[PDB]
Design a protein around this ligand. Sequence first.
Ligand SMILES: Nc1nc2c(ncn2[C@@H]2O[C@H](COP(=O)(O)OP(=O)(O)O)[C@@H](O)[C@H]2O)c(=O)[nH]1
Ligand SMILES: Nc1nc2c(ncn2[C@@H]2O[C@H](COP(=O)(O)OP(=O)(O)O)[C@@H](O)[C@H]2O)c(=O)[nH]1
Ligand SMILES: O=P(O)(O)OC[C@H]1O[C@@H](n2cnc3c(OP(=O)(O)O)ncnc32)[C@H](O)[C@@H]1O
Ligand SMILES: O=P(O)(O)OC[C@H]1O[C@@H](n2cnc3c(OP(=O)(O)O)ncnc32)[C@H](O)[C@@H]1O
Ligand SMILES: O=CN(O)CC(=O)O
Ligand SMILES: O=CN(O)CC(=O)O
Ligand SMILES: [Mg+2]
Ligand SMILES: [Mg+2]
Lengths: 431, 431
Amino acid sequence: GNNVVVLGTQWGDEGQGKIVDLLTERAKYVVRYQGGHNAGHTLVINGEKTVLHLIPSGILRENVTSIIGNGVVLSPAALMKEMKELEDRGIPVRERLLLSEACPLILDYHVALDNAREKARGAKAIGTTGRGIGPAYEDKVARRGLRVGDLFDKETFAEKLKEVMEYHNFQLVNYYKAEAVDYQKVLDDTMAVADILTSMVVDVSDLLDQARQRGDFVMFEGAQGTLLDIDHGTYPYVTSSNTTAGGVATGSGLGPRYVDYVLGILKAYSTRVGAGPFPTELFDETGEFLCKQGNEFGATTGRRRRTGWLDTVAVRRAVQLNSLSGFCLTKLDVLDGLKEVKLCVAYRMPDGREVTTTPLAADDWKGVEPIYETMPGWSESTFGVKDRSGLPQAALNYIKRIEELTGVPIDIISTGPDRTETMILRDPFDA
Amino acid sequence: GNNVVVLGTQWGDEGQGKIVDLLTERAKYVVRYQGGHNAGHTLVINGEKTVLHLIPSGILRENVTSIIGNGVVLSPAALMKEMKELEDRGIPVRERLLLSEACPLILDYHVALDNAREKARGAKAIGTTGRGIGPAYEDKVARRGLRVGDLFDKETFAEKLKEVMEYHNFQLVNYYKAEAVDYQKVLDDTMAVADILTSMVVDVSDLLDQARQRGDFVMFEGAQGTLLDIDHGTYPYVTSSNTTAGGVATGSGLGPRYVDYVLGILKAYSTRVGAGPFPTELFDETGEFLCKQGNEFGATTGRRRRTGWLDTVAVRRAVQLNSLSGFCLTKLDVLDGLKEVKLCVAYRMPDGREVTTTPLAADDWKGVEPIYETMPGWSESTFGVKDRSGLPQAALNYIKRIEELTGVPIDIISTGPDRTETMILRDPFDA
Ligand SMILES: Nc1nc2c(ncn2[C@@H]2O[C@H](COP(=O)(O)OP(=O)(O)O)[C@@H](O)[C@H]2O)c(=O)[nH]1
Ligand SMILES: Nc1nc2c(ncn2[C@@H]2O[C@H](COP(=O)(O)OP(=O)(O)O)[C@@H](O)[C@H]2O)c(=O)[nH]1
Ligand SMILES: O=P(O)(O)OC[C@H]1O[C@@H](n2cnc3c(OP(=O)(O)O)ncnc32)[C@H](O)[C@@H]1O
Ligand SMILES: O=P(O)(O)OC[C@H]1O[C@@H](n2cnc3c(OP(=O)(O)O)ncnc32)[C@H](O)[C@@H]1O
Ligand SMILES: O=CN(O)CC(=O)O
Ligand SMILES: O=CN(O)CC(=O)O
Ligand SMILES: [Mg+2]
Ligand SMILES: [Mg+2]
């Protein structure tokens, strides 16, 4: 298909970055449609590592035009920091990147609010990335937030920012009893970059309608994972945007009937960073092995990632929510050297009923237990293998099993962080 | 197609209700996926009028199961009022309606906030429907809002509501200097209905995945119109949800690749209620004629609707944003007896450039002028006509012209408020 969607089928960090950088080789565009700089996607080319937060993952291919879509909450400061960092490395960011005037802006006060709210929650802290994600989304939805388009008239912007900050500062000092964020300070910082931001504005929806008509290859880059979806995730332990496939159209302007293939990135075992239900979570040596071998530390907060076994019950909710066309099984190599590997095929509800469907809000997961299928592991190193032939039968079985349980074909398998340690069994762009 | 989407291509009130009630005749389900009780859809059967707000439009057909999807912001009070009203009229609401445990709840404090914010905006008041729509969406996105699922444990709900209301009451009295909303009062009112709400909960995403697999006919009912979309509309003069087609998946849980046909409801002339750009707006006698003949008063606030000429430039933004498959031209009969009728084919930008594309945020519409094509009107009454044969050539030309300008076929034409005063040239369910 022409329009391919790449998203995390779990709770983020499944390996979308690597997969976007890899498939973009034939793409004209790459579009981020939700989230902000809470994401942290690692590209590794010939050993050279790049971690992107807000900048789309096609940024290293000069043949691709990177687009930050309207669904994205955009921090000017964040953008500037990543730009300078990539430019210093020879990546002419300003020539490859475009953005939406409809993108809300994340300013220092959103960070102050996120921290305050997080503090206020005490024991029940969501465990957010400390960027002002949610607050920026609140402002958007309240219709008081500033957007990239507002920079098109600095005087009027200055007026708008004053009103908003006075509003939020009132709450910050009187209610949370936190320090106020300085108006002038934010105003100045933002104006210093305005012209750069503004210089990259394109009408994204019209642009994508044109690409679509030309049959151009487009890639949509997800952020976070399905179970972190504001609507369908383990609420309130979630991110504030829709991480599921419908977010592709809300956050880019492309008509929903133009999605041709939805590629769901699937890790091979599970990880979650932040508070929240996690049925297959492991607190034993194997959990520790998982973290270790898979270097599971948040590419944005550096926080350690909780690890567990692949949960086919949760993954099946992702299948239906996102109309998966296929999966990209990632981090298989990490399972190398395990006597056995298991996957969750059902959930035992606290009331005794066996179920193969997941609960919705976090509280409804309270006493659910995972029911497993334990399969043989494999001692052979599968790292960097680019051919199924090079995978042991235990590895292939685990693979067939997952397809069986989900009803979705594993079209791509990743065996290491490098762009090329992968086997593409079927290229989404050809399907 | 099996999954058909019906939405307003303008700024709401295009006539979605009538169209949903009509096409649902062959449908198993009807799903609202965004908005709340700000909508006001008028069904008219054999002269008998029904105005729905939160309850889906298939509610009068016992063969259809009505579903309030997760994208919808749900007011328990609002639901109860409409239920009692429809039940008194013989419509066994509780048997035909189902809802999502993921739907946020709109409580009295959201109304108090909406009014406060609206007051605070002074001259720049959005002109909202006075329901707590935006505030309920803010709470959702902030992850502090209550949802239908929270009612599954009344003690814990009571705890949660206390925290939230204390938070909002603080803002209401200290900052807006408005009266506080009573905790106990809201708690009691909400608990009185809890069991009823809770009794209608179904897992909507899984339900729709099952319908889809059975090839069941499903209809998705839009609320508001494209230009009121939180992301793509004339921001901030908008509603807080995505009214565009991507909202179908975010607000129902159905995979975006399962939308088969998107039917865009198109009024024949334009109307807008609430503040906001409106290029083709008429302040003359013809504008007055439009309001009058088309009884243009908000079916929810009773406020008068601003009227103007059909704007093909704005409609073309809706074509691309929603991947329209076809249109339903409504209220043609209203144009009866006009020497001429015109439609906007382009916009003159304040800088002199001619454009056929629309600006995004409200401010970017500031001095845009509409450029028209003036066509002959028709004196013949087209009211209640169910055959193109019964339309005069001037009416048919106007029709061909619109298709020409948009590149989208007008599959259905409505000629009066009654369910049957319509011509279906092509049934979305068959395409
Ligand atoms: N060993 C191994 N590491 C991988 C593989 N694919 C990706 N990685 C690495 O795993 C991590 C993925 O985490 P993150 O970058 O936060 O995921 P993302 O946000 O979805 O892109 C990074 O460390 C990648 O370099 C793979 O197949 N094998
Ligand atoms: N004269 C006329 N009225 C119509 C037609 N279709 C719908 N209506 C009426 O027009 C209004 C549509 O407004 P509203 O119900 O608020 O629109 P909705 O929110 O999209 O359903 C109601 O008064 C309907 O009864 C039509 O083709 N002709
Ligand atoms: O409001 P937020 O600050 O977004 O936090 C809410 C919740 O979401 C988690 N979280 C946010 N972004 C994440 C991410 O990005 P990528 O996969 O794109 O690299 N990967 C993993 N977990 C992520 C947070 O840790 C917390 O549990
Ligand atoms: O936060 P809100 O209270 O939703 O208001 C924001 C803006 O949106 C307008 N508006 C909201 N719902 C509308 C509706 O519903 P239906 O077409 O479904 O019948 N039809 C027309 N205009 C509508 C409001 O008047 C204001 O301009
Ligand atoms: O890769 C990004 N995440 O793991 C978010 C974080 O580091 O908190
Ligand atoms: O039909 C519903 N609208 O016109 C909203 C309103 O009455 O304000
Ligand atoms: Mg990451
Ligand atoms: Mg209406």
